[PDB]
Symmetry: C3
Amino acid sequence: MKSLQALFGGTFDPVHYGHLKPVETLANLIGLTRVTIIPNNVPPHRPQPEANSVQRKHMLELAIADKPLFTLDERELKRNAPSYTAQTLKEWRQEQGPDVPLAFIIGQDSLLTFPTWYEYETILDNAHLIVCRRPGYPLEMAQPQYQQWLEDHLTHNPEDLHLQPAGKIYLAETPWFNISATIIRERLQNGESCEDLLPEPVLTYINQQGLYR
Amino acid sequence: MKSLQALFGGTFDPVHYGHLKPVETLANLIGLTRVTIIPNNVPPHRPQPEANSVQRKHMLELAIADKPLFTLDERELKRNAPSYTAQTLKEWRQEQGPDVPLAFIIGQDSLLTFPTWYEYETILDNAHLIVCRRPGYPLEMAQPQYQQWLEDHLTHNPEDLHLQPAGKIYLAETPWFNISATIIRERLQNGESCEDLLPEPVLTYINQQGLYR
Amino acid sequence: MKSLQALFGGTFDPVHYGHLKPVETLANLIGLTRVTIIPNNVPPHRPQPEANSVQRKHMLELAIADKPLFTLDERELKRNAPSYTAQTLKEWRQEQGPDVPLAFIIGQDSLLTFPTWYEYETILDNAHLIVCRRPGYPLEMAQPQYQQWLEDHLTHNPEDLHLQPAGKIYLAETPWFNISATIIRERLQNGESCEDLLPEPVLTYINQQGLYR
Ligand SMILES: NC(=O)c1ccc[n+]([C@@H]2O[C@H](COP(=O)([O-])OP(=O)(O)OC[C@H]3O[C@@H](n4cnc5c(N)ncnc54)[C@H](O)[C@@H]3O)[C@@H](O)[C@H]2O)c1
Ligand SMILES: NC(=O)c1ccc[n+]([C@@H]2O[C@H](COP(=O)([O-])OP(=O)(O)OC[C@H]3O[C@@H](n4cnc5c(N)ncnc54)[C@H](O)[C@@H]3O)[C@@H](O)[C@H]2O)c1
Ligand SMILES: NC(=O)c1ccc[n+]([C@@H]2O[C@H](COP(=O)([O-])OP(=O)(O)OC[C@H]3O[C@@H](n4cnc5c(N)ncnc54)[C@H](O)[C@@H]3O)[C@@H](O)[C@H]2O)c1
């Protein structure tokens, strides 16, 4: 078993503390020396992002400039066809080999929607799922069958993440943040301060570019 | 519910690691993007501080120059008259509004003396109380009537701090530090090293100013 | 009880993230303002290091240059006679006084071998033992008698480390890392990347010196 690697996907419109901080602590809780962020272009499961692809990428770079834990993989931004996490993870698995523990990080709100993802069942064959807590979201799946799926792959010992290359779901004890890209976009539109919600470099870039206005 | 905001009050004569480190970790444990420190100007529950308001402010700015989590609120500092936490928190609630979760952070030794504070019962109407562990101090209130008050407001699920505006007392699992401003002043008096107890820039300022000797 | 101090010993051939990250997080979990790394030369319990004394020391200074938590103690590299942790801790105890809690940090793999150390029984008379988790290792001593010794000194309350000068063994809940110096040396020799396994500065020095590869 090689060193546990982690990937974190998202649209990040814009990237903010609710995306970053839970993950940074995750690295100290379970042991990650590197987290690859995988931004996407126009995900099917959601409306068009306000900031375009180039701007969202730049904001991510600005945000991790002084945080070596993070790096970017632009495969989904450059992909000509739409991307699917099941596909990106299949690829990562082939590239890294069968002995590299691999984990895909999501927030509690995305775990609730996981069973609706493209070929979701294949994801656990290629990687682990590490879920970060989000305040106020239900902890159990909406439907009984998907709750069973969850319990079927659930582990309470994060050590398991380092001992197998994939297959486990772990609900990490990460910090809570009542922060969303939506609230930030609206605060900016309303002329309310976002100073304590996302990196200064990102905020500054947002204002320089006139984004979300 | 907006983002949980935290306040950290004290005299800081001088600010040292026992003040800062528990709060820095607290931010990563429960989710704080900003902690506003509120230094007072000669409080009623203790004698005059040796360093004056200008010096303690300076030492705090030196201690947090590198720590973006922190910012200062000099409302009690620049005020010559006596200040009371209950009044400060009442003002904070009025200013921030009813939907902002607000927490006032204190150490275990301060929790034990909490029932003697000016109109202490109004504090939980305006904010939550986050208590940082301190080695050696009792965990239970001296008098049963106050242990009951503690028990009636306690929560073991820090997520509560993010879902209600105020009212809970949470005993956080923060790092322990056998450090106090008194030990620091006394060691300086005996010409014993205080390296490892507070920031070097703070110690430098102290010697430059001739403070505590 | 004065402030709890910690010592971290090892060969570090080379120092990597598996050595540092568990310890850095340890400082935030239990409360440590400083950890003194004690590198050794050619200890008898293991073969001769590939990298030499000055090289391993230089790699340590490079790795901690920007991590103020750490400092180096060169006594075991400068000592003429062979070094023994029991002796180094006896000296520390003598130098620090009887009221400083002292802790020596090791990984689970070393704890398993602890009963074979030179005068191992005297170590707990002089300091506490703090153990960092390591994935895949047995949690219990191989022989019942040493497991007895383990259980007899074991505490599940880390506050104990700050209230007594020595005597307890605490198994800290630190991050896991599938990293070893042996795998690094192999990889470098086979020309494979070691980018996410140890500090960039240390990798650079390794290349400059022609080490391992
Ligand atoms: N292949 C598919 O069918 C499919 C369907 C849906 C989503 N996805 C993937 O899931 C990933 C996340 O998509 P998204 O739309 O949620 O991205 P997003 O940009 O909204 O959020 C990024 C991540 O941060 C988490 N997060 C956001 N705010 C948080 C907060 N305040 N606290 C804690 N965590 C928080 C989200 O749950 C998500 O995992 C992407 O990689 C996306 O491609 C794939
Ligand atoms: N309004 C009132 O009647 C009243 C009465 C007492 C205190 N207070 C307020 O309570 C706050 C704390 O005052 P103080 O005199 O104790 O301030 P202080 O400067 O001594 O300490 C600041 C904070 O650090 C905590 N702390 C100190 N050393 C610590 C350590 N080693 N580990 C963990 N925590 C540690 C203290 O308990 C306190 O909450 C101030 O805002 C003060 O005004 C108000
Ligand atoms: N005095 C004696 O008789 C005696 C006998 C054996 C060892 N020792 C001492 O024990 C200390 C450790 O020696 P070593 O040979 O194991 O040093 P090392 O350089 O191999 O490792 C340094 C420390 O890091 C820990 N570690 C390494 N990889 C880790 C990982 N991936 N995750 C978590 N922890 C990890 C090790 O267990 C050890 O405590 C040294 O101070 C050595 O002198 C003393």
